[PDB]
Amino acid sequence: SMNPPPPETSNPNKPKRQTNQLQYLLRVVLKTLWKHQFAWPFQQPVDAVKLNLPDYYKIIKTPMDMGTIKKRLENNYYWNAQECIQDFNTMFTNCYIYNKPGDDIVLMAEALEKLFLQKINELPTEE
Numbered sequence: 001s002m003n004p005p006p007p008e009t010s011n012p013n014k015p016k017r018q019t020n021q022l023q024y025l026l027r028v029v030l031k032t033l034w035k036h037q038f039a040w041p042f043q044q045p046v047d048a049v050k051l052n053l054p055d056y057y058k059i060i061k062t063p064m065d066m067g068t069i070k071k072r073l074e075n076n077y078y079w080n081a082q083e084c085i086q087d088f089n090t091m092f093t094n095c096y097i098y099n100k101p102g103d104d105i106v107l108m109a110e111a112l113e114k115l116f117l118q119k120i121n122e123l124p125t126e127e
């Protein structure tokens with residue numbers, strides 16, 4: 001069995017910025033979700049080999065996880081807040097696509113998504 005390479009976290013030719021909204025995404029959003037008791041399955045790419053999920057990467061074609069988001073935020077990989085918000089949404093959506101309602105992993109994603117939505121509701125206006 002094999003995992004794909006992880007999503008890109010470094011690209012020198014990609015234009016990027018350090019905005020107040022992106023700072024909020026790291027200091028408030030990512031940090032809140034990262035410390036949560038249900039964050040652990042989402043702190044690194046899904047390891048389909050170790051978890052014995054050979055169909056995972058046959059179904060999930062745009063993988064995303066908080067370890068990748070954390071690296072992207074720390075490396076100032078993004079141009080805007082929308083790009084980062086899309087990464088969080090991809091992460092939750094993938095979990096719902098792959099799994100069944102009521103599964104433990106889905107309940108965990110739902111708890112993190114609730115907090116995500118609460119924090120993004122207060123995303124500051126751009127400076």
Ligand SMILES: Cc1nnc2ccc(NCCc3ccccc3)nn12
Nearest residue numbers: 041042046051094095098099104105
């Ligand atoms: C992320 C992600 N997206 N879909 C899946 C499917 C399984 C999975 N297993 C990780 C270990 C685990 C088992 C039970 C409950 C919580 C975590 N992680 N995962």
